[PDB]
């Protein structure tokens, strides 16, 4: 009951089926966390989007990371990280400075 989930990205994805012509799937990328430092995310995909929200929920509890927080708010030290054509950079702030981030990263 402690785990909140947020939908990061819902997307309409298509395929080519000999029978049907186009075939429409929905894929949602979803994250989950308790606020206490452990959290994770997963992808899920289904024909009906409701189904897919469900799928990502459950699969995401299965991958959790523990995220270590300094004095239980910031990160410990600056992080500059290049991952696959995307660069992430994050500075460790003091207390009055709430969450200045990409909207996704705020959510996470």
């Amino acid at each position: 009951d402690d785990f909140d989930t947020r939908i990061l990205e819902v997307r309409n994805v298509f395929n080519m089926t000999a029978k049907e012509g186009r075939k429409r799937s929905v894929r949602v990328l979803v994250a989950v966390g308790n606020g206490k430092g452990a959290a994770g995310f997963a992808i899920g995909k289904a024909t009906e989007r409701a189904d897919a929200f469900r799928k990502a929920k459950n699969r995401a509890v299965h991958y959790l990371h523990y995220i270590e927080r300094y004095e239980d708010h910031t990160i410990y030290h600056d992080i500059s990280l290049k991952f696959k054509r995307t660069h992430i950079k994050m500075k460790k702030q003091p207390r009055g400075y709430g969450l200045h981030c990409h909207r996704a990263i705020m959510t996470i």
Binding site: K92, P94, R95, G96
Partner: protein, 292 residues
């Protein structure tokens, strides 16, 4: 004799009385924060850093000068009655010259009365505050020094703040300075809150105003209850330095003196409530025989 705050005896005794608390000395402040700086140190480097801290804390801890009151200065430099009929409201002439000590500045006035008068003290100060703006100072006196606001700030146990407010706003020899400092001491006394200003730079003012008000009560009681003997010792020592000739002084000195004998003889010879001292001076004593 010549005792005063700036004497070495009074100084070293009041520094020792005050105490170094690096937590209360350096405490979180409300200013816009910056991200914290980190470095890895040896035992040695941490010790040297610690001493560095203590050194710098002393400077933070330096006592605000206590001084006697200033008398009103009334002197007229000239009179021409011919000007009087101009019936114009007051003119205020200040000198602003960057070399000058602000007690050596010349501040003058011409009233509608056609006379050349020197500026009064309050007047003089608010003038210098206009042309030499210094932070924290209002040029018109801040409301908070009304009795209501005073009591409100005392309730909130903010007394360090008030005493920090007067240091900046008024002048150490002023009337208001003295009124507020002293009244504030009266409050910590009637509330027994003395340990507030303990690691503060304000402690010197606590000690003095009381030795000269000859009520050492709460501070001695508290010191013995806080399990500090040496402080009560140097404090009676102080009452002896600011009162050399009295029964208590010369008798409880020349007879013999140390922790037990001088603190208890000055507990018998200062009668405000000697029953309080004698009670607590027993308790600490008892709490020794159990701990040793």
């Amino acid at each position: 004799r010549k005792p005063t705050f700036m004497d070495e005896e009074v100084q070293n005794i009041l520094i020792k009385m005050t105490g170094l608390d690096l937590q209360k000395i350096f405490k979180p402040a409300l200013q816009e924060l910056k991200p914290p700086t980190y470095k890895l140190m040896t035992q040695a480097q941490l010790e040297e850093a610690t001493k560095q801290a203590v050194e710098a804390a002393k400077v933070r801890l330096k006592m605000p000068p206590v001084l006697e009151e200033r008398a009103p200065i009334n002197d007229v430099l000239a009179e021409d009655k011919i000007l009087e009929g101009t019936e114009t409201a007051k003119y205020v002439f200040t000198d602003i010259s960057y070399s000058i000590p602000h007690r050596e500045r010349f501040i003058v006035v011409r009233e509608p009365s056609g006379t050349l008068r020197k500026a009064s003290w309050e007047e003089r100060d608010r003038m210098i505050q206009v042309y030499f703006p210094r932070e924290g100072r209002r040029i018109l006196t801040p409301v908070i020094f009304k009795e209501e606001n005073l009591q409100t700030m005392y309730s909130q146990d903010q007394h360090v703040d008030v005493l920090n407010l007067c240091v900046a706003q008024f002048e150490p020899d002023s009337a208001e300075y003295i009124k507020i400092h002293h009244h504030t001491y009266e409050d910590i006394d009637k509330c027994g809150k003395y340990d507030l200003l303990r690691s503060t730079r304000h402690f010197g003012g606590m000690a003095w105003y009381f030795v000269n008000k000859k009520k050492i009560d709460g501070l001695l009681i508290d010191q013995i209850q806080r399990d500090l003997v040496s402080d009560a010792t140097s404090l009676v020592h102080l009452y002896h330095i600011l009162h050399p000739x009295x029964x208590x002084x010369x008798x409880x000195x020349x007879x013999x003196x140390x922790x037990x004998x001088x603190x208890x003889x000055x507990x018998x010879x200062x009668x405000x409530x000697x029953x309080x001292x004698x009670x607590x001076x027993x308790x600490x004593x008892x709490x020794x025989x159990x701990x040793x």
